[PDB]
């Protein structure tokens, strides 16, 4: 049927909806390629290349990305696709197959599975930066 999940890097959130379909993937109303930077494009195609083209051919994927900037969105998308594929195989397909798939993703990178939790250190008075200070002089 359908499973819904997310990815979260910095202040970005990317919701992934993994349903029964044919291999159509959209990002909001718009096709998956239409995200712009060619270098970071490859990062979002990266899980498709680790898993081949057959697995997506049974499933349609819809993605909703809100918040955060450019780099943050790309990682959140990458993370959400990961979390989506693996979660769908745990509810619907098969736990052993899912474990094999999870092993392939883990073997490549843990960043796909679970987002980096780095976030801002607050500004503190006495300087423009988070820790940086005004120039002192004698």
């Amino acid at each position: 049927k359908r499973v819904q999940t997310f990815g979260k890097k910095k202040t970005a959130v990317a919701v992934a909806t993994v349903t029964n379909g044919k291999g159509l993937i959209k990002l909001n109303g718009k096709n998956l390629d239409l995200v712009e930077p060619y270098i970071l494009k490859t990062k979002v195609y990266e899980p498709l290349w680790l898993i081949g083209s057959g697995k997506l051919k049974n499933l349609d994927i819809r993605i909703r990305v809100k918040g955060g900037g450019q780099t943050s969105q790309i990682y959140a998308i990458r993370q959400a696709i990961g979390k989506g594929i693996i979660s769908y195989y745990q509810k619907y397909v098969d736990e052993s197959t899912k474990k094999e798939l999870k092993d392939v993703l883990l073997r490549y990178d843990r960043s796909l599975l679970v987002g980096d939790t780095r976030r801002c250190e607050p500004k503190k008075f006495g300087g423009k930066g988070a820790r940086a200070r005004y120039q002192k002089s004698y």
Binding site: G23, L24, I25, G29, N31, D33, Y45, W49, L56
Partner: protein, 154 residues
């Protein structure tokens, strides 16, 4: 360049299925060729917005502006002039003073919107507050989007 190998299934049914720029340039070129919307003459002497602080310096830009606006209208179905002014805003170097974004010139925007509206592309309503896209335009934009997608792809 424009074509690349793809690892998923494209749909090609809408403007949301094709890259902004190719659609925009072709539609702008088509619009000027057809001659549906005027230049108009006074528009060559003014700037797009104050962040430019220079002439627009690119000749065919008015058709491009119309083309982008039309696309924005399919993207976001209810908007007014302020949305456009904010959209086309960019940064203004204030000389010694810091930068700020500064809004796009509203007459040229207002005129484009009005010409499209006259030609049945876009529509002022109370049911949805501002300008929306309207039916002759919706059909044309969708169809032109298909025509371009096929023509570019193979």
């Amino acid at each position: 360049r424009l074509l690349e190998p793809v690892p998923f299934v494209k749909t090609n049914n809408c403007i949301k299925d094709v890259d902004a720029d190719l659609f925009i340039r072709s539609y702008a070129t088509h619009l000027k060729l057809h001659n549906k919307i005027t230049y108009p003459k006074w528009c060559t002497f003014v700037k797009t917005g104050k962040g430019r602080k220079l002439a627009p310096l690119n000749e065919d830009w008015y058709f491009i502006r119309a083309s982008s606006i039309l696309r924005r209208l399919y993207l976001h179905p209810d908007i007014g002039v302020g949305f456009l002014r904010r959209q086309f805003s960019s940064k203004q170097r204030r000389g010694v003073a810091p930068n700020h974004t500064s809004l796009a010139s509203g007459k040229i925007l207002r005129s484009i919107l009005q010409q499209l509206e006259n030609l049945g592309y876009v529509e002022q309503n109370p049911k949805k507050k501002g300008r929306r896209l309207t039916t002759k335009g919706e059909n044309a934009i969708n169809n032109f989007a298909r025509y371009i997608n096929k023509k570019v792809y193979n």
